[PDB]
Write a protein that binds this ligand. Structure first.
Ligand SMILES: O=c1ccn([C@@H]2O[C@H](COP(=O)(O)OP(=O)(O)O[C@H]3O[C@H](CO)[C@@H](O)[C@H](O)[C@H]3O)[C@@H](O)[C@H]2O)c(=O)[nH]1
Ligand SMILES: O=c1ccn([C@@H]2O[C@H](COP(=O)(O)OP(=O)(O)O[C@H]3O[C@H](CO)[C@@H](O)[C@H](O)[C@H]3O)[C@@H](O)[C@H]2O)c(=O)[nH]1
Ligand SMILES: O=c1ccn([C@@H]2O[C@H](COP(=O)(O)OP(=O)(O)O[C@H]3O[C@H](CO)[C@@H](O)[C@H](O)[C@H]3O)[C@@H](O)[C@H]2O)c(=O)[nH]1
Ligand SMILES: O=c1ccn([C@@H]2O[C@H](COP(=O)(O)OP(=O)(O)O[C@H]3O[C@H](CO)[C@@H](O)[C@H](O)[C@H]3O)[C@@H](O)[C@H]2O)c(=O)[nH]1
Ligand code: NA
Ligand code: NA
Ligand code: NA
Lengths: 372, 367, 365, 357
């Protein structure tokens, strides 16, 4: 019956749910707090795995919808459930239009906002759009910023954020990984094991809209070429749920016995697969954080990254969508064990130790459960 | 957890559901595919229950203007196709659902396959809109499952590339075989009690162009045959339209020799057709099913999309002329040589497997 | 008071309005017919110039709208004005989603359809989308087809159209040009070799248009006497690519869309034309202007075969080379204007459409 | 017929219209540009000859509902009018929601009067956060002062995206330069405007009491108080001052009449941002009826002093200026530009969006 700080948790996508799940679990377990989940948007599957129970699902998001229409709906309609649920403080995560529109909706009701995973920057204006501008808008709206790294905290100060409002918590994705590594029952997959057992397996994920069509086609051609040249090499490619992404990989690779094209994997099964892989090709932000933590070299299928820490430490290299460079760089790592080891620093942490949820909780308690 | 080709299956009517059911079952059993059913149209629940079809979405779109119905399907089918992550969409036959759904799929750059492609009368806008629907679907579809060589030829004459056409045969033969293999579910006490010990004619008639006077002439032909042949019985399952029910009821409800029926479950309907001495119909599907059971067919139309049965002597056009119907039924009952002259046109019952292999070749292959 | 065949005319874009205008004028002048215009969608300006008076404007089309939503609205809502205006027959033009959705809406009311400019094909499935599929859908819906060329008539027969339903009328765009042939631009072009350039196709937005703009910049640097006039398609992304590449070049006049009369006068003064426009590929050869086509495919193969036009795509080196050849070698220039062939008709297409309509729908056996 | 850069101009209030008017006129006169106005006052539009292409009838109402409507509905007119670039002004929820709506359509945004800060988070709300959001959305920033340009750099804006243009309010004043005349003619007249929501009720009551006290103590002193059109603001001034013959309570004045009155006034008491810029330009000392200002330049130069809503301090500070000619002259003498801000904005627009490398 003692007062709980009621913490609004707003998300619409898989990566947000994964990164918020450890914070929701920590808020639930701590008697000083009550998490209140509102979704805007695969998601049921992540909710089931971590035991997240949304109080409200706004049925706002969908493929083939204008950004302005979606943002209009969130700004217009999120206020009522935030007020109805007596939210004291609202947490948003990452770079989504949900995170931006929900932070604004909360600000309109004078509900203080905290930003989970604050301060990631490429330094390329409106690239990608709208994610890069969303981060800069959330940064001005948020009272409190949970930065995953010292570098991200530095980016926040450069945008005029006061040092007292920035906490380097590390990234909750490390917490999330550790939670599913501790769940063998849920992690198991007969077909994936049978396909990877005794082979060098490359794990590949690619989803970014700016790479749709021709650039993804070049990456698929690089996969085909590596498979032809290296009969013992395998690829597992879990496909982003977009029909255009599925079509490009399917039309380039569906006949190659060396490639297992997959449906999206449950997070537990995906982390187990990543642990078994020899290396990871991705344009995913989260996989750039997860893979180095499992000691897997990462080749980044982009011309820019918001994870410069892995680049500077040699854990990750930019490869873009150049098929000759991808073939070369994957070859180097498979053929030269010294090049392979130079990309593994598996006793060094870029993105936190897996206690980020507890560091977020203590920041919330210091800011909103304290008096001078 | 391996990637499945997600195949949208869109239908609104009984004949579509019957012809798609064997393809749904084959897609379900094959690990390379996942069927996703979206309905637009309690006849259908009954077919879904019998074949174990489980719709993911029912749109509740289908006495309504064609333009309003087509507008709603074009407008609203895209969202469930995108939400269900459909890779490819299959439509069947000649319905406004098949056309509007093919168009809605094309708008989302979802490739379309047409089940039972290339049937033509050669009579423009007859019937309307079914004849034009086929020609529109033909231009929208990437892949065409033709039941016969003749149907494949009709597709090439409309500029379809030979590589996009597969002669699969008709899945209605697959569907028939599935319910012939289920005697327990095919049983019907009341039908057996009515037909036991008598020669039974099976009659179905539903086409809008025959409503009112033409159906009345067919009902008069039934009445005349019944008066002249006291031992003859008819079973007439009625299409669920009040005007069709009223014409048959007002002409035949007092004749002890006629059993007017509610629509029959497909299993029971095929068992009845197997027991019948001959079949009178304007149904496309029954023109395919009846010859496969060795039953002579008299076709209650001035045209057919099944010319193969006509050319092979399995079927004869009789239109809605009561004198000709009485004569032609009489000939078959009285002259065993005429009967035997009217006993594969439409495939071997492996059409679902041939569709699956065409889908795998087109959309589960890389160069 | 004698019965007129009431002919529905449905369009939503400038190119449709230009190509339908001569048919509307011929229908208006002939006592056997009454044109009834319904718009779905610059257009006021074309309506004013040719004296077109729409009976109904549906206000369906939009810059940022899903194809399915637009097609749904036309299928759903065009029937009411067609019935209210007692339309007997409907004419649609070209390859637009309006032409397809309106033909379908007309078919739903059992209103017969005629297709103006029928049978143009690349042979590249769904390229562009949805225009290539729209033509093939309209082709199945239309009772009557006005083909601009014998080649286009051949494409219709290969899709199962009966020969009696196909008339080679020629293209009404030639009629339209002739109607308009009977000040800042003048000052800019007067003493100078002027290239006219239009480019609008969605498949070329961004990088390909950037390459074309770079080709223009290179030609301007190498040839100080050369001028370009570039009327810009009204799309902000198209305007941005040309503006960001060319706005400082004194030799380039970037323009707002020109009124059709002013555009045809400019084309007559130009030394040559670079375009991805269908209509400009038909208009330019008729004024004896060599055309370089900024696409990898064309629906006007007649101009290619007759040497009037050449495909140049969006390859900047090839564009620089091909424009250079025509400016520098008067024999190469004359080879693209050789007399002796008329590709797209003589400018009597409206009258040939009218007589096909009278034969089909104002006759009894 | 040559291509013009089509510049969207979006505003919903009098202060925005006044500050945008000189930019609209400069865009209209220059052949390289075409202004396209979308509104979210008729009298200000008439005075400067502004002709809106579209009026969205959105403003009245919850902040979230208004912002939702602008984000949701402004895109269509921006696309229909073929806008190439969009300009927003000041700190309004219109300026923020319109900048966002433009960004959603990949229309580049310029912010007129960029970089004003108090440094007090969410004070006032939502104006202080609106500026910081517009700052991240805008490609181009027209800062009125070097101080404002410095505030933009501290929020990570690149120096190349910031132009110190000065404030277009000076341009607007220059463009405009009977009962009021009869009331002010032979007399020392104080001009007072006060409208800020954070001062409604008790604080405005204290300011009205200060006016009453000054009037009682100084029979020769007059006040003109044009009242903000809010019934609560009108009620507080009316109930405190309507019987005082030395106070003329007014309806809002047309901009030309307001600037003429300010020229005749001996000094100005205001919580208006624009009046803090206009008054020093006419050599009128300003006492600012707030605890903070976004115009620190006038404070530092001695043109303006903060007085808040403390009646004793207001009485004292007005007394000092009326009684001591040395204190008066210390508050008179450019803080906010020379009146060529429109032309400097135009040249920044031409350099950024009407140039090729
Ligand atoms: O089959 C799969 C593939 C991936 N994952 C997980 O999904 C997440 C990645 O999701 P993805 O769709 O690739 O998004 P990201 O690119 O990782 O995330 C973007 O969006 C987030 C929310 O705004 C931001 O935090 C990130 O910085 C930004 O890059 C990771 O935790 C992966 O382990 C699965 O569980 N199953
Ligand atoms: O009591 C009954 C009567 C019929 N049937 C079955 O229903 C189907 C026929 O349905 P019907 O309404 O008569 O439609 P058809 O006329 O067969 O089908 C039309 O519509 C189909 C869908 O577009 C096309 O494939 C056909 O060519 C076209 O003729 C057949 O399989 C019959 O066996 C029953 O199950 N029970
Ligand atoms: O500033 C300009 C530019 C062009 N035009 C005229 O506009 C037409 C060209 O319009 P455009 O937008 O380029 O479209 P097109 O590419 O010509 O037309 C497409 O759309 C038409 C309608 O479906 C089809 O007939 C064509 O085959 C197809 O290529 C021609 O008459 C030009 O002379 C002007 O009047 N002013
Ligand atoms: O009776 C009157 C009173 C004032 N004014 C004029 O109105 C403007 C002031 O408007 P006001 O309602 O007081 O608004 P401000 O407080 O000046 O403006 C706020 O809103 C603007 C737009 O967001 C920002 O530029 C400012 O920094 C911010 O303080 C000035 O130009 C005055 O000259 C009149 O014309 N008549
Ligand atoms: Na708790
Ligand atoms: Na399956
Ligand atoms: Na006429």
């Amino acid at each position: 019956s003692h007062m709980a700080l009621r913490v609004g948790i707003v998300y619409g996508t898989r990566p947000e749910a994964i990164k918020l799940a450890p914070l929701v679990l920590a808020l639930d377990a701590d008697p000083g707090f009550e998490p209140v989940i509102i979704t805007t948007g695969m998601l049921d599957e992540i909710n089931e795995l971590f035991g997240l129970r949304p109080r409200h699902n706004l049925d706002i998001m969908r493929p083939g919808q204008r950004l302005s229409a979606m943002a209009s709906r969130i700004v217009g309609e999120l206020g009522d459930p935030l007020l109805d649920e007596l939210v004291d403080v609202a947490v948003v995560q990452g770079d989504t239009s949900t995170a931006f529109a929900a932070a604004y909706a909360a600000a309109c009701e004078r509900i203080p906002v905290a930003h989970l995973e604050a301060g990631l920057r490429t330094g390329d204006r409106f690239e990608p759009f709208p994610e890069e501008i969303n981060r800069r808008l959330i940064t001005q709206l948020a009272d409190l910023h949970f930065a995953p790294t010292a570098d991200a905290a530095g980016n926040l100060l450069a945008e005029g954020v006061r040092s007292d409002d920035v906490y380097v918590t590390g990234n909750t994705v490390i917490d999330a990984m550790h939670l599913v590594l501790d769940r063998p029952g849920d992690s198991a997959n007969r077909e994936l094991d049978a396909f990877t057992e005794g082979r060098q397996t490359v794990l590949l994920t690619m989803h970014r809209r700016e790479s749709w069509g021709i650039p993804m086609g070049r990456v698929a051609a690089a996969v085909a070429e590596l498979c032809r040249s290296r009969p013992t090499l395998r690829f597992v490619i879990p496909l982003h749920p977009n029909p255009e992404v599925r079509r490009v990989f399917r039309s380039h690779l569906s006949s190659l016995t060396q490639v297992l094209l997959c449906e999206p994997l449950r997070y537990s099964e995906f982390i187990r697969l990543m642990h078994r892989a020899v290396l990871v090709l991705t344009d995913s932000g989260g996989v750039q954080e997860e893979a180095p933590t499992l000691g897997k070299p990462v080749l980044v299928l982009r011309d820019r990254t918001e994870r410069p820490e892995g680049i500077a430490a040699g854990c990750a290299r930019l490869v873009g969508t150049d098929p000759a460079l991808i073939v070369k760089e994957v070859g180097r790592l498979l053929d030269d064990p010294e090049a392979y080891e130079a990309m593994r620093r598996p006793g060094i942490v870029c993105y936190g130790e897996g206690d980020a949820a507890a560091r977020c909780l203590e920041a919330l308690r210091e800011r909103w459960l304290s008096s001078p």
